[PDB]
Design an enzyme around this catalytic site. Sequence first.
Site, PDB file in Angstrom:
ATOM      1  N   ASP A  25      57.514  29.410 108.195  1.00  0.00           N
ATOM      2  CA  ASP A  25      57.648  29.460 106.669  1.00  0.00           C
ATOM      3  C   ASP A  25      56.382  29.751 106.039  1.00  0.00           C
ATOM      4  OD1 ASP A  25      58.359  28.960 103.934  1.00  0.00           O
ATOM      5  OD2 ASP A  25      59.474  27.101 104.307  1.00  0.00           O
ATOM      6  N   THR A  26      56.247  31.152 105.857  1.00  0.00           N
ATOM      7  CA  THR A  26      54.902  31.558 105.202  1.00  0.00           C
ATOM      8  C   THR A  26      54.737  30.908 103.678  1.00  0.00           C
ATOM      9  OG1 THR A  26      55.989  33.771 104.400  1.00  0.00           O
ATOM     10  CG2 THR A  26      54.822  33.550 106.672  1.00  0.00           C
ATOM     11  N   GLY A  27      55.934  30.522 103.032  1.00  0.00           N
ATOM     12  CA  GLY A  27      55.648  30.189 101.752  1.00  0.00           C
ATOM     13  C   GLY A  27      55.335  28.602 101.737  1.00  0.00           C
TER      14      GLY A  27
HETATM   15  C1  LIG Z   1      65.546  30.010  97.947  1.00  0.00           C
HETATM   16  C2  LIG Z   1      64.191  29.036  97.833  1.00  0.00           C
HETATM   17  C3  LIG Z   1      63.290  29.600  97.470  1.00  0.00           C
HETATM   18  C4  LIG Z   1      64.731  28.226  96.693  1.00  0.00           C
HETATM   19  N1  LIG Z   1      64.121  28.474  98.968  1.00  0.00           N
HETATM   20  C5  LIG Z   1      63.345  27.417  99.427  1.00  0.00           C
HETATM   21  O1  LIG Z   1      62.799  26.987  98.641  1.00  0.00           O
HETATM   22  C6  LIG Z   1      63.652  27.078 100.823  1.00  0.00           C
HETATM   23  C7  LIG Z   1      64.192  25.835 100.995  1.00  0.00           C
HETATM   24  N2  LIG Z   1      64.212  24.957 102.445  1.00  0.00           N
HETATM   25  C8  LIG Z   1      65.298  23.759 102.249  1.00  0.00           C
HETATM   26  C9  LIG Z   1      66.602  24.390 102.307  1.00  0.00           C
HETATM   27  C10 LIG Z   1      67.330  23.881 100.857  1.00  0.00           C
HETATM   28  C11 LIG Z   1      68.707  23.817 100.837  1.00  0.00           C
HETATM   29  C12 LIG Z   1      69.500  24.624 101.927  1.00  0.00           C
HETATM   30  N3  LIG Z   1      68.946  25.067 103.171  1.00  0.00           N
HETATM   31  C13 LIG Z   1      67.535  24.795 103.040  1.00  0.00           C
HETATM   32  C14 LIG Z   1      62.963  24.871 102.703  1.00  0.00           C
HETATM   33  C15 LIG Z   1      62.042  26.025 102.525  1.00  0.00           C
HETATM   34  N4  LIG Z   1      62.148  26.836 101.291  1.00  0.00           N
HETATM   35  C16 LIG Z   1      61.265  27.638 101.500  1.00  0.00           C
HETATM   36  C17 LIG Z   1      59.664  27.638 100.818  1.00  0.00           C
HETATM   37  O2  LIG Z   1      59.236  28.506 101.524  1.00  0.00           O
HETATM   38  C18 LIG Z   1      59.622  27.789  99.218  1.00  0.00           C
HETATM   39  C19 LIG Z   1      57.978  27.458  98.808  1.00  0.00           C
HETATM   40  C20 LIG Z   1      58.016  27.514  97.174  1.00  0.00           C
HETATM   41  C21 LIG Z   1      56.796  27.335  96.585  1.00  0.00           C
HETATM   42  C22 LIG Z   1      55.217  27.750  97.261  1.00  0.00           C
HETATM   43  C23 LIG Z   1      54.299  27.619  96.601  1.00  0.00           C
HETATM   44  C24 LIG Z   1      54.347  26.638  95.649  1.00  0.00           C
HETATM   45  C25 LIG Z   1      55.416  25.847  95.053  1.00  0.00           C
HETATM   46  C26 LIG Z   1      56.699  26.650  95.626  1.00  0.00           C
HETATM   47  C27 LIG Z   1      57.918  25.926  98.907  1.00  0.00           C
HETATM   48  O3  LIG Z   1      58.349  25.066  98.725  1.00  0.00           O
HETATM   49  N5  LIG Z   1      56.379  25.706  99.243  1.00  0.00           N
HETATM   50  C28 LIG Z   1      55.942  24.314  99.338  1.00  0.00           C
HETATM   51  C29 LIG Z   1      55.889  23.407 100.656  1.00  0.00           C
HETATM   52  C30 LIG Z   1      56.904  23.580 101.472  1.00  0.00           C
HETATM   53  C31 LIG Z   1      56.521  22.452 102.692  1.00  0.00           C
HETATM   54  C32 LIG Z   1      55.472  21.725 102.548  1.00  0.00           C
HETATM   55  C33 LIG Z   1      54.524  21.801 101.714  1.00  0.00           C
HETATM   56  C34 LIG Z   1      54.689  22.680 100.622  1.00  0.00           C
HETATM   57  C35 LIG Z   1      53.860  23.073  99.487  1.00  0.00           C
HETATM   58  C36 LIG Z   1      54.458  24.326  99.080  1.00  0.00           C
HETATM   59  O4  LIG Z   1      53.657  25.468  99.525  1.00  0.00           O
END
Ligand SMILES: CC(C)(C)NC(=O)[C@@H]1CN(Cc2cccnc2)CCN1C[C@@H](O)C[C@@H](Cc1ccccc1)C(=O)N[C@H]1c2ccccc2C[C@H]1O
Lengths: 99, 99
Positions: A25-27
């Site tokens: 998960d690069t995000g």
């Molecule tokens: C379609 C959508 C975008 C809504 N998807 C997600 O959010 C999925 C959800 N699943 C789950 C899912 C949910 C429902 C159904 N199937 C699966 C788990 C993983 N994410 C992917 C994440 O990569 C999204 C990012 C968004 C973000 C980045 C930076 C700042 C704010 C928001 C994310 O949540 N990143 C955060 C993050 C994540 C983990 C640990 C630390 C941190 C900090 C932060 O970088």
Amino acid sequence: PQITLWQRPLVTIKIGGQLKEALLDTGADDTVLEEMSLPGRWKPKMIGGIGGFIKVRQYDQILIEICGHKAIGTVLVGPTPVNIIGRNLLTQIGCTLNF
Amino acid sequence: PQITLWQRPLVTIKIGGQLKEALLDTGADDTVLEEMSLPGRWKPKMIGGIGGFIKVRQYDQILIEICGHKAIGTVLVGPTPVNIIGRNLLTQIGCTLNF
Ligand SMILES: CC(C)(C)NC(=O)[C@@H]1CN(Cc2cccnc2)CCN1C[C@@H](O)C[C@@H](Cc1ccccc1)C(=O)N[C@H]1c2ccccc2C[C@H]1O
């Protein structure tokens, strides 16, 4: 390997002698695993994504093997929907995004 | 390009003649952009992140320009903190994860 993105990028990880599935998960800034018991003391952390913040447990210097690549690093534990491998450990195993 | 993951993988996109910055997120199934007005009608959708679910508006058949490369696909618009390019558009521009 090279992983294309038509399907979720799920790899198999080994941690605590167990095999789990996790999303590359690069995000994600950090690595969060589902509720498990890991060795040692923990600190508190709040991480925020879509839908808000969750409170997780931070363990440090944990050994986790991703695709037979050993990384030792910080692992968070908490009510995450999927195990997520994020940038702190992706950089360790040499992972880039290419196009 | 070959994007490394020491920093968040932020690039410039163009949608609706706006330049925006957005995150290349292999952990996202969909593309979710911050509240903006788009051509067309929308279906409402609930998508779930890390802290639970948000309500988004789903537009189909939208063109986005990522680092030059065009891509067309579904785009969800809603209360997200950051703009996120998920797998649905990452595949169209030929993006892979390599280690
Ligand atoms: C379609 C959508 C975008 C809504 N998807 C997600 O959010 C999925 C959800 N699943 C789950 C899912 C949910 C429902 C159904 N199937 C699966 C788990 C993983 N994410 C992917 C994440 O990569 C999204 C990012 C968004 C973000 C980045 C930076 C700042 C704010 C928001 C994310 O949540 N990143 C955060 C993050 C994540 C983990 C640990 C630390 C941190 C900090 C932060 O970088």
